[PDB]
Design a protein around this ligand. Structure first.
Ligand code: 0CG
Ligand code: SF4
Length: 309
């Protein structure tokens, strides 16, 4: 059985920075370090950090006065930021710079009292954080997930309207939403394309190439990782069986029995050791040396804040 590896795969720059922020805080201040929400959506990274003394909480009311609190890569609303500020907390912000960039635009529209529409998945922490940058009652902030949501949205002033997106969406489905937004609201303003980040766009391009060759695609990532689930969905829509798995223990023998080519990739929040264990298990199941596909080069690094070197 041939094993192919997608390229790029695995950690993005914002995840590598966010995990470093927590590790460095642990190293400098000791346990406990509180983290609002899973720092990234990966069970193995979060369980690990928990074992080292990070305590993951959903609400600031769970954190003791005097504590150090880190905000996760996905970002937080101004309400959450203000609640930490008003509390006795020392805060470090692991929000990825590419999320913060969207936040700055939503805050700008808020100050102007002009309405904004976010394309994103309800309930996801990045969407809570981004919607939570808008607070002007004279304007409005609306969420759409699909073209049907667009066809039902009414706004107060469609002449002054802008849109933003979550960073980890499907590139193809978001294109359909924007096409519907521009049909319904021809004066809407946005970025040139969307706010989907380079790592999400690149891993979906890489999974498309992988799926063209492989019969089955395994995506290493946790169930709550949006970007990871997009990679599995992309391969399934190309007619390949694709499974989102946390680790090698999840691989069911029947998924690869009699398969000639299996592809492996990993979401932006999944560490490379999990991919190496998955390859080792595919080799038990008859796979050869893993062959890396050629891929788009990534070169971006985001440094930790100077206070945490
Ligand atoms: C932030 C970030 C990148 O990865 P995850 O933590 O998996 O996040 P989402 O893909 O937005 O769910
Ligand atoms: S998936 Fe993109 S926006 Fe999210 S942390 Fe990674 S680089 Fe940043």
């Amino acid at each position: 059985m041939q094993i192919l590896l997608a390229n790029p795969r695995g950690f993005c720059a914002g995840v590598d920075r966010a995990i470093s922020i927590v590790e460095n805080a642990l190293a400098i201040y000791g346990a406990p370090i509180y983290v609002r929400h899973e720092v990234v959506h990966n069970r193995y990274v979060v369980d690990s950090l928990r074992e080292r003394g990070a305590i993951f909480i959903e609400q600031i009311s769970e954190v003791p006065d005097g504590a150090i609190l880190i905000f996760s890569a996905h970002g937080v609303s101004q309400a959450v930021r203000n609640e930490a500020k008003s509390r006795d907390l020392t805060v470090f912000d692991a929000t990825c710079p590419l999320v913060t960039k969207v936040h700055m635009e939503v805050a700008r529209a808020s100050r102007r009292g002009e309405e904004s529409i976010l394309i994103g998945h309800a309930g996801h922490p990045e969407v809570e954080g981004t919607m939570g940058q808008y607070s002007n009652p004279e304007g409005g902030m609306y969420l759409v997930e699909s073209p049907d949501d667009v066809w039902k949205l009414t706004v107060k002033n469609e002449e002054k309207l802008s849109f933003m997106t979550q960073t980890t969406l499907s590139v193809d489905d978001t294109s359909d939403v924007i096409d519907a937004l521009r049909k319904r609201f021809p004066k809407i303003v946005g970025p040139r394309k969307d706010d989907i980040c380079y790592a999400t766009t690149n891993r979906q391009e890489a999974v498309r190439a992988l799926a063209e060759q492989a019969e089955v695609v395994l995506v290493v990532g946790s169930k709550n990782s949006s970007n990871s689930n997009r990679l599995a969905e992309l391969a399934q829509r190309m007619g390949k069986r694709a499974f989102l798995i946390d680790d090698a223990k999840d691989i069911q023998e029947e998924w690869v029995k009699e398969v000639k080519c299996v592809g492996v990739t990993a979401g932006a929040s999944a560490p490379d050791i999990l991919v190496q264990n998955v390859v080792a298990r595919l080799q038990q199941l008859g796979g050869g040396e893993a062959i890396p596909l050629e891929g788009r080069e990534e070169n971006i690094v985001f440094e930790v804040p100077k206070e945490l070197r």
